[PDB]
Amino acid sequence: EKVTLVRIADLENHNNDGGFWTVIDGKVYDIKDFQTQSLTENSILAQFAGEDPVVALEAALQFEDTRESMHAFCVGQYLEPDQEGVTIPDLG
């Protein structure tokens, strides 16, 4: 219904809160909880447990089965401070 806009500030300070996040596909996913599920047998991420959780997230986005649980890890959409604070002329 509403777009959760995560900033670079949120990304940094929430890591100190104990929730390590990352920015992929213009979205912010919870890697701390991701890797916990990856350590759990019979979980879709247990096959990606030998891979780095941030890279394994991309493989999980790519695969149609595993992208369904990515909806659970996606805290919100990432939007940069600079990105909405600039007027862009039609030249790109």
Listed residue (30, 36, 44) closest to 74, CA to CA? 30
What is the rounded CA–CA span in Å between residue 64 and residue 92? 32
Are residues 19 and 34 in contact, defined by beta-carbon separation less than 8 angstroms? no
Q: In which domain, by residue range, is 2 found?
A: 1-92
Which experimental method was this entry solved with? NMR
Give me the number of domains the chain comprises: 1
CATH number for the domain spanning 69: value is 3.10.120.10
Report the half-sphere exposure of 16 (CA within 13 A, side-chain side): 5
What is the rounded CA–CA span in Å between residue 28 and residue 64? 19
